[PDB]
């Protein structure tokens, strides 16, 4: 019973019947509240490519509540985030585990936020190289390359060494918002709207 | 099997087709009428983020009829509620158990209401502590952290000690509207619109 | 279920209500983000034939994230791509295996790109004689013609010999963006707007 | 995962929901990309009858990628195509087996095309037909009559004898675009719009 | 909790628990009470070959209540019945349609019986000449061969001409025990054990 | 779910395990406790044919609790009951509707019994016709013969005219044990062992 | 639908409960009455290896009614048949298509039989070489080796050339018992027994 | 689909129903004819541990027809095979891929056989993890250890270098019986009884 | 579908059929080859309680190939193992993770073995709520208590500190047989039956 409410308005002379997620997309807000799967990667990348078509310079806000995902889908989104020319804001509401922590740390330095009770983890809890039979088929020398990619990206994003990233990816523990700042995953804890999201009319 | 009714008003030039829940969202009314799950949390946070992107100062009304949920989803919604800059009114119609009681007590102090026959409980039945179906990855120190977060938030919201909150979270009992006022969960019992802040409609 | 967000443009008060993928199609962007099946081939060819009807000379961008597919569907899309009179840009986001690599290499020479962490393979992964239509069909001597067709097309697109393509098609390994340039599958690696070489001029 | 794309205008302000297949239908393009079943025949005949209501003289383009089908549905579409008063262009993208080859050869002589790597077969793929939820169920003397009809029609369309059509219909082999021209199934192999490089032939 | 009741007697040389159908097999009684399918034909032929393995000279009784079946399965059983060296008694209880009518008429002349209210039909009610492995159906010259085989066997068994058998196979009507004797399908109506060539199998 | 208790035996030199229904079959007791379907008729006829193979002269007891069934299956059992040479005792426990009433009245005259609260009906109840709910087979002019067969048999068994049987088959009402005696369906109401024969000689 | 009768038989020493197929296995009779799949090959090979352990010199009779199968399973059974040291008799009841025809022709030359109305085909129907959705499935050069193996075995077994076997494997036609003798598939058509346990009666 | 014929034989006078696979187990024959999964490994290891309890010195025959499997299950069986003190004979009937080839090459040197048309491959055609609980993740250093174990064991069993084993495990090709002898996977191709160990040793 | 083989024995007294697992149970061998769930624990404890009733002094061998399980089931089995009075031998074939490692280390000191390529982990790979009623019961302070119990038992069994057990339970890594000896999980690596104790002909 997943009710998907809509939005449309009369503060002027208008219309615009769209659902709630398309509305937030009008403010350049992208929601990641899934497991990071291949069908999600396509929808998020599609949203990211569209937002670059509209204004390739305005900031984009990404809100992340993800229990994990797959390396193949996460790497696709990360490369798309790096492919963008504008600044990307990443907010962690709730949990950002494994791939969620990768995309969270992939935001523009200084614009990666978390909420006071957010929890973040680098360990991949689910999906041993392949998880559910929806996303399958990874040989040997291929998971190492994807894991080597993930370790190198996390080390670059956080500022830790690749060795430390590998060691901490083996530990099944979450870290709080304050710990994640020290680790390099995020930049600031917030408790009210950081007005980095402010736009009303384009320019 | 329960029909999502639609709505059409008389703004003259604008005529606008939305369902009943999107209509209530136009009055800054958010409905929580089911278990607090991860997909529901995403919808509720999306609604909350949209309502702040439209009027970040106008009051928001949240109506809660929830048999419970998961701590991770509730903490995400609570942090989003605290993330808002405007006042939040919480109304308990029917039942607000565990996570429903958390969001109910999370409203702005003085603006937390319940109906005469409402029932409220802080005890979390079963193992509703993370995520959704499956999503049951634990370690030890993570349940301790999530329960410590919930106990600390409930103690702050209600005004009771953390020890009392933990002790009462172990008891499977409901409390009425009058008891919930004494406990600190809510502020006032109501039975009509004017029992809240009254704007003095003429007669 | 994956929420496919919708879109609303400017300068007119009306009611589009088109999704994100149809929106990108307005910019002549075609998304291939799943297995290359017969129903998918119909979608891509329909998109390709429509884009030729609107402007048969403007460039078309194809974004590819495909774990593989079937030769029967791949050959249909390739012939349609060669059937186009305009330039085709192919971008590999994530993975392009077997049929994904065929369509990726089918783009206009100089306009085949990949992202820094993309993975490409010509081997048909994890199984497959190719061909399922509620019935396998494609007897022995028919798969040979299709495999010979695929080998000849890959050799023509990449620049390698047919013998090398056949030898490399039996090896279950992926190659990175730099290796794929040397191989002939793609032309350029892409990681920023100023490092494009694509220079997306439109709208 | 599904067939997504939609279409809107350019020659005004942009408001009406058209999917990709109805869009191509506005250019009098009919897509046959699956097994020739009874529900498909109804849709195709409905499209054909509609296209005749708008212009009984405008040319109609039919694109065929079909692994086969049933005699009852194929004969119905063929009779409807012969029922049209305008010229019918048939394009074979990918595979046209049995019923696909019948409808492909049913186009106006001189306007039956195939793509360079297309494969065509007159044999009923896999097995014959008696009907399992797709051709109902057929007595003895009736499948012979329907098979005789198909043999007689193919001989007239291709120019071969009825004996050779029956004689070749038992052989499970595909033929290429060049072989199909010699056989009489099609007229020209192409690599650009309609008659290669132009909506009309030059000499 | 097992259906198909069990039985015990034959205390002479001593034996154990068998089901009811195995009991009748001890009296050389074979039951055909459902559609003549390929798995049923295998069971019946296995039973037919076993009774010939024990003593190839004692009479065999076949009781038939079959609404029809497939020609491939019926021809297999008929050839196995003709392959036997002993006399075969066929009894029609209830209905013997199409394939049931062939096996009924395949008994030794003079030992084909029916009960007073039995109904017999030569028509196959629209569908089924082959069991099929959920993959395959039949070419033209293959239905013709199977129909010729069925017509020739029925003409030989009943004594009618092949033309009349073909004509009557197109008519969807049942015939009674008296009509079936005149037709040649059976030999005698019995309506009791002690009547006619068999005076019951008792002991 | 339909627990079928088992039993173990003295009365021969063998020793063995059967369920409760197979045991009652050793006392020549046949249970009919469900709808008269084609698979049930085969089981009942198999039991009847086996009981004749052991003693074609000893009495057989049939206990009937049937809400109805189909004429094709009922006629098969009735003809098999008439095929027996020994006396058949029919007992109605609970309900005997349509086909159940046919088999009940088919017992040897004087040996058809019912229990004090049993209910009997000649009307064919809610549902399907003569055969199977989905696999349905008789065609035109076949209902006349099958209904005439049922009317003629009921008239002979009960002693009423065919006209009265046809008229009473049209009314949806049950009759008690005393009414069924007057009607001719049964002979005696019973309530103790001595109401049976139990003529002489120990057992 | 369990339709496997059991035996406790008359004509044996002792007391045992085996099903009908195990009974025929005691006479060294192996039944192949369904599609040649991988699980079937394992059971058949198990039966073949058991029969060699019991008496590695006594003849084995195999009865074949198979609509086809897969090359991998067919090759496994054929190699096991060649692995046996005793003579193998193959009987074709009904149909022996593709793999069934391979195993039929694999019997000892001079001891391959068919019934008068049997139908045999060497064409591999439908398509594929293993797989219902993803069963095994093979790369290119591996299915070719299996097809070359099958062609070479059929040519050796029948006596035809490899070229003719390849040509006839592409033609969807059946041949009768007399035609199959001329082709080399079988040796004799039969209509009466020739097996051992002859010239004697039981009891 | 579990057709598993039974047997009752000379473990005495002959009185016990066992299936065909347990039958070969009485001759110390173990069948591996399906995917090597965790439940299969438990059954096979249980069979292996039982066979060592009965006679820890008598030879064991293992027949292998396996399309592949999982590393964890294969390693478990191999360690159990190496744990045995007696000689193990491995026969490859049909296909032995990846894990099947591991167990095949794990037989006692000199006692590893294949049939003339058997196909063997060391490449894992599917890959991925084993789903041991379908809930997990598999880190880096664990796939490396499992792949290193497989490479080291295959190199020791075959005699090739670990580097060659790694290179050939990436190539999707099968090898014939003669090629597998040269490779070291097996020792002899067979077509009759061939080798054994019961006599004075050759020298 | 693994075909759990059956067994036949006692060539002196005769007649019993047990499966392979019940067979090994007669040798006081208990197999744990799956996830340690509540239904599995009941079977294992039942086996353990039976084995103590027959001989409460003879050694018991437990073979473990378990990817994990639930604490409630693991604690139940462990307490039952400690409840036994006889020596318990634990063998790790393949993998012993979390609960499997608990039961493995619960064997009598000096009699805990592993195979050369076995892998052992104390970390619970993904879950840990533990329990029943759709996988979710068991409140917070109760999972913490059960985890404390598990840490205390592992520390006592292995010899490490409780702090080290807690620290290592959070690390997702496997250790080999040699590492497990140093850690305290096991005592000896083995590679053949006769590496420990002595078994020969009885007296
Ligand atoms: C059948 C045996 C005895 C055999 O192979 N022979 C080979 C060669 N013989 C003559 C020979 C000798 C040397 C040379 Cl140079 C050439 C020819 C004689 C016997 S067997 O291999 O012992 C065997 C196979 C299978 C089974 C089982 F599967 F049933 F268990 C049991 N035993
Ligand atoms: C000790 C072993 C090696 C053995 O050989 N035995 C033989 C006979 N026995 C007879 C018996 C019967 C009944 C009873 Cl009451 C008592 C004794 C008992 C044991 S073992 O424990 O079987 C064993 C250990 C490890 C492995 C592994 F490593 F492969 F996994 C496999 N087997
Ligand atoms: Na609680
Ligand atoms: Na590279
Ligand atoms: Na009464
Ligand atoms: Na013939």
Residue numbers in the entry:
A (entry chain J), B (entry chain H), C (entry chain E), D (entry chain I), E (entry chain K), F (entry chain N), ...: 1 to 203
From the paper:
Caseinolytic proteases (Clp) are a family of conserved multiple-subunit enzymes found in bacteria and higher organisms that have become an attractive and novel therapeutic target to combat infection. These barrels interact with hexameric AAA+ unfoldases, such as ClpX, ClpA, or ClpC, to unfold the targeted protein and facilitate its entrance into the proteolytic barrel. Proteolytic activity requires alignment of the catalytic triad through conformational changes of the handle domain that composes the interface between heptamer rings.
Here, we report the first crystal structure of full-length ClpP2 as an inactive homotetradecamer in a complex with a candidate antibiotic at 2.66 Å resolution. The asymmetric unit of ctClpP2 includes two opposing heptameric rings that form a tetradecamer with a height of 77 Å and a diameter of 95 Å. Lack of hydrogen bonding among the triad indicates that the ctClpP2 residues are in an inactive form and that a conformational change is required for the catalytic residues to interact. This means oligomerization leads to a ctClpP2 tetradecamer that is shorter in height, 77 Å, compared to counterparts from other species, > 85 Å, except for saClpP that also has a compact handle domain. The C-terminal loop of ctClpP2 that includes a mini-helix, α8, is situated such that it acts like a lid toward the hydrophobic pocket and mediates a neighboring positive electrostatic environment with residues Lys197 and Lys199 in addition to residues Arg28 and Lys58. For ctClpP2 and ecClpP, the hydrophobic pocket is proximal to a cluster of positively charged surfaces that interact with the electron-rich fluorines of the trifluoromethylpyridine group.
